[PDB]
């Protein structure tokens, strides 16, 4: 009698055969299915309710019954036909962790993480057939996120005067649950739902240093936190997390691939803040064409080529859009590019040739070379994001923003149509270092979360 | 019940590759009820269906409206009729005490509502045959936005094709009544969108109606500001924003089902301008297919978001971001481009004061202390002010000292935010060139696109 034998294990906290992965327990489920055939739903509930040593917990007994229902009716030849049994049991299993004193909760914690990974993969595959199953997009994964969110809400820290140092299972998987939930929100194209998860993470944590969590869970959290910040156009906030996540990673081929994932975001984020990587240490994580691609953009930005930056983004438009990088790069890269273009002008005009007054006509000639074609010009009669923003006519506007961002120490004389800088040979007095100026104006949230 | 088939089951696949090796045998499982979390608006045209009693009952209400000349007697007659109607409609399963609700009101305003508004004297002159008529015209009255408790009856809600008919009537007859009719049009257009929500309908009629209503909102924004007629800018933009959210949601659902909407790019572009500084809309637009992202209207809107972005933009709850362009000069150049769609320009006129303030705020920081006041002629051309009176009023609002009545002393600008604490916002304004473009076209042509 396998059904009685299974119930004996579950009643005593033994969950060896309590899984949805038939690759692990298919033989026992096959025997269970044959023996359970013929018993209706009421009898399966009676088997659990009447079983000796069964915990007197409604949710635990509901969980056991749903597994028996799963075993009886599972169709291994159809994932879709069995999905309702699988998803129903998973919800029942997670409900067994909501109460912090639920029976066998500590033994259930490894089962819940193991089953969560199974159900997340299955929900993703089912969602890809949303048209055929007549379900809305991301319906399966969004349901999982709903279940995992409720488990997240039920996690609380012990008292401030706890009698022991014990870390309960719910606290042990807190960051694991956070990363799983935020990964789902990114997958279902609603990453702003991470906001609640990020805000309530630390208050629920009993550890009072973020570095006490597992390093791999630390790195993924910073990766997702940086991506969330970058989606809000908060570049410096994202950079600090991206930079700290990658440095911790440097201290498996999956680790190498994960490092590449950070780099895809860290490189453009650092570039906006006037920081460029050393390509040497990055070789194990990046293919040579990736290095060459960013190096071309590095060349355009470093020497103040506005048209080159626009054309580079145009070439890379599709894959930048897939990572939500196109808009932030298109908006916040020009001012770094403009600073470098203006810096070279002042280096020759002021520090070398001694002229502290810069006529606007000189800047317009410089800007005409850098920007090139614009929406108004012949040959480009339709507006694009690549020819519709920058125009050499707007000399004063370019200078004003550079000054207002702290990147250019200068005075503007609109009636005289000239720009006045300090009389010096030291260029850094007129054009200070970019990264220091930006980070001083926009301080970031500390890399030390707590 | 759950979907069991041959094609779907084969496509989704098995749980494991070879179940029979593990001891499983193929069993004919009974059909199981669909789980609660897999329950699923309508995206395709449905044929209009009306219950025979509902059709007969509505025809009696119209007949009684013609026969009973006393206003209060007719209303009380239809009141007791409506009480009978609700229970019968409840018994038929066509209204709740889920039901796929279908509206069956074939007028632009339900007959019961017409009689009610006769008693409350809330009928507009636009809804009467003649101004002094005691009765609301059946062919002119428009259903108001419902502000109730009981669920609306089928006779209260217009079906999608009647909703299109109502908007067609508004476009053909009521656009030229602006700005006087703005309160009427805003409420009636809100009701048209409400009826679609009542039926949970997102078919082509809902897309077409929401699209043209959004266009009407953009036309209204310029007409009210130009005519200096007092109105709630907030209420006009809220409904305009809500209709854009609805359109985005229908565009998403249509894409998921494999269809297309011809006008999606135009209204994705409008949505990019509803919250010009919200990074959310930059994120969402990047997810869309290439042909939507690269459409000239979307590209134009994206340019405006870039030029308007400012690292000094100051407002409670707004997070400043790095390296923003603050390209006010480019903004006013783009504003004057003949390739700028007129309704799109009407949307962007909402930010004229904000862009102007931060232009003066940024320029003043580049001036040294000895610098003379900036001549108005320079600022008028740089900020595209309509006339000398507008720039004078602008400087007065922000306490910018005016010297000799023709120059602004920019160092006297003490505010760091466009929004003043204990003051009403500056009177909204417009651009002369956009007004001239409006006078060279028709309202109907703009709304119909």
């Amino acid at each position: 009698d396998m059904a009685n034998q299974l119930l004996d294990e579950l009643a005593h906290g033994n969950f060896s055969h309590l899984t949805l992965n038939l690759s692990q327990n298919g033989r026992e489920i096959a025997i269970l299915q044959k023996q359970l055939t013929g018993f209706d739903d009421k009898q399966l509930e009676t088997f659990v309710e009447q079983h000796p040593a069964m915990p007197n917990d409604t949710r635990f007994k509901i969980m056991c019954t749903s597994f028996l229902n799963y075993a009886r009716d599972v169709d291994p030849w159809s994932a879709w036909s069995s999905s309702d049994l699988i998803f129903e049991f998973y919800q029942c299993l997670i409900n067994c962790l909501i109460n912090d004193n639920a029976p066998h909760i500590e033994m259930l914690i490894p089962v819940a993480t193991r089953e969560t990974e199974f159900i997340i993969n299955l929900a993703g595959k089912l969602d890809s057939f949303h048209l055929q199953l007549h379900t809305r997009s991301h319906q399966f994964l969004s349901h999982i996120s709903s279940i995992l969110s409720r488990l997240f809400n039920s996690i609380k820290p012990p008292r401030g005067n706890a009698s022991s140092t014990n870390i309960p299972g719910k606290q042990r998987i807190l960051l694991y649950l956070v990363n799983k939930l935020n990964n789902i929100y990114f997958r279902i194209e609603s990453p702003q739902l991470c906001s609640n998860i990020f805000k309530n993470f630390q208050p629920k944590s009993m550890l009072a240093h973020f570095n006490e969590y597992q390093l791999d869970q630390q790195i993924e959290y910073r990766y997702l936190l940086g991506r969330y910040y970058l989606l809000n156009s908060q570049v410096h906030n994202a950079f600090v997390q991206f930079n700290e996540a990658f440095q911790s990673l440097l201290n498996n081929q999956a680790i190498t691939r994960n490092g590449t994932r950070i780099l895809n975001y860290m490189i453009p984020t650092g570039l906006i803040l006037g920081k460029m990587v050393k390509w040497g240490p990055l070789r194990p994580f990046l293919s040579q064409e990736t290095i060459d691609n960013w190096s071309v953009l590095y060349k355009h930005v470093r020497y103040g080529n506005i048209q080159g930056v626009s054309l580079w983004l145009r070439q890379n438009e599709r894959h930048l859009c897939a990572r939500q990088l196109l808009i932030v790069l298109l908006e916040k890269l020009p001012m770094v590019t403009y600073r470098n273009l203006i810096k070279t002008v002042i280096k020759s005009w002021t520090t070398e040739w001694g002229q502290n007054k810069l006529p606007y006509s000189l800047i317009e000639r410089v800007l005409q070379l850098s920007i090139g074609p614009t929406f108004e010009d012949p040959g480009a009669q339709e507006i694009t994001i690549y020819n519709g923003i920058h125009s050499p006519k707007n000399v004063e506007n370019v200078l004003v923003t550079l000054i207002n961002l702290g990147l250019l120490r200068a005075n503007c004389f609109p009636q005289l149509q000239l720009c006045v800088v300090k009389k010096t040979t030291m260029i850094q007095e007129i054009v200070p270092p970019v990264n220091e100026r930006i980070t001083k104006m926009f301080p970031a949230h500390s890399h030390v979360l707590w | 019940y759950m979907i069991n088939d041959a094609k779907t089951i084969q496509l989704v696949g098995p749980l494991i590759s070879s179940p029979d090796n593990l001891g499983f045998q193929k069993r004919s499982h009974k059909a199981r009820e669909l789980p609660r979390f897999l329950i699923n608006p309508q995206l395709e045209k449905r044929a209009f269906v009306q219950d025979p009693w509902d059709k007969a009952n509505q025809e009696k209400m119209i007949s009684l409206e013609e026969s009973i000349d006393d206003l209060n007697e007719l209303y009380e007659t239809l009141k007791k009729m409506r009480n009978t109607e609700r229970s019968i409609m409840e018994e038929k399963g066509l209204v709740d005490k889920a039901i796929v609700f279908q509206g069956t009101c074939l007028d632009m305003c339900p007959t019961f509502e017409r009689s009610r508004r006769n008693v409350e004297y809330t009928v507009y002159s636009y809804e009467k045959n003649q101004p002094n008529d005691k009765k609301a015209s059946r062919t002119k009255a428009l259903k108001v936005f419902a502000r109730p408790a009981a669920p609306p009856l089928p006779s209260d809600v217009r079906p999608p094709h009647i909703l299109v008919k109502t908007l067609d009537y508004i476009v053909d007859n009521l656009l030229t009544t602006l700005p006087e009719s703005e309160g009427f049009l805003w409420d009636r257009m809100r009701s048209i969108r409400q009826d679609f929500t009542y039926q949970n309908y997102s078919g082509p009629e809902a897309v077409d109606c929401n699209e043209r209503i959004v266009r009407i909102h953009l036309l209204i924004l310029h007409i009210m500001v130009k005519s200096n007629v007092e109105f709630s800018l907030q209420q006009e933009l809220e409904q305009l924003h809500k209709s854009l959210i609805t359109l985005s949601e229908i565009y998403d659902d249509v894409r998921s089902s494999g269809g297309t909407c011809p006008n999606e790019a135009e209204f994705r572009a409008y949505a990019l301008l509803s919250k010009i500084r919200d990074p959310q809309y930059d994120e969402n637009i990047q997810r869309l297919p290439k042909h939507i992202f690269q459409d000239k209207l979307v590209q134009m809107a994206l340019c405006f978001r870039r030029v308007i972005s400012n690292s000094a933009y100051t407002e409670r709850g707004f997070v400043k971001t790095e390296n923003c362009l603050n390209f006010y000069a480019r903004f006013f150049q783009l504003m004057q481009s003949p390739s700028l769609p007129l309704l799109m320009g009407f949307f962007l006129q909402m930010h004229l004061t904000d862009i102007r303030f931060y232009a003066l705020r940024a320029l003043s920081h580049t001036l040294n202390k000895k610098h003379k006041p900036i001549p108005f002629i320079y600022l008028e051309n740089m900020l595209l002010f309509n006339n000398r009176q507008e720039i004078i009023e602008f400087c007065n609002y922000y306490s910018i000292e005016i010297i000799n009545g023709d120059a602004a002393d920019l160092k006297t600008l003490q505010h760091y935010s466009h929004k003043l604490s204990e003051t009403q916002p500056l009177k909204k304004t417009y651009l002369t060139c956009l007004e001239r473009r409006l006078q060279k076209t028709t309202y109907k042509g703009l709304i119909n696109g």
Binding site: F413, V420, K440 | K369
Partner: peptide, 11 residues
């Protein structure tokens, strides 16, 4: 006519 710093206003 010379450069006068306005970092206090800028920052």
């Amino acid at each position: 006519l010379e450069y006068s710093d306005n970092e206090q206003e800028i920052q």
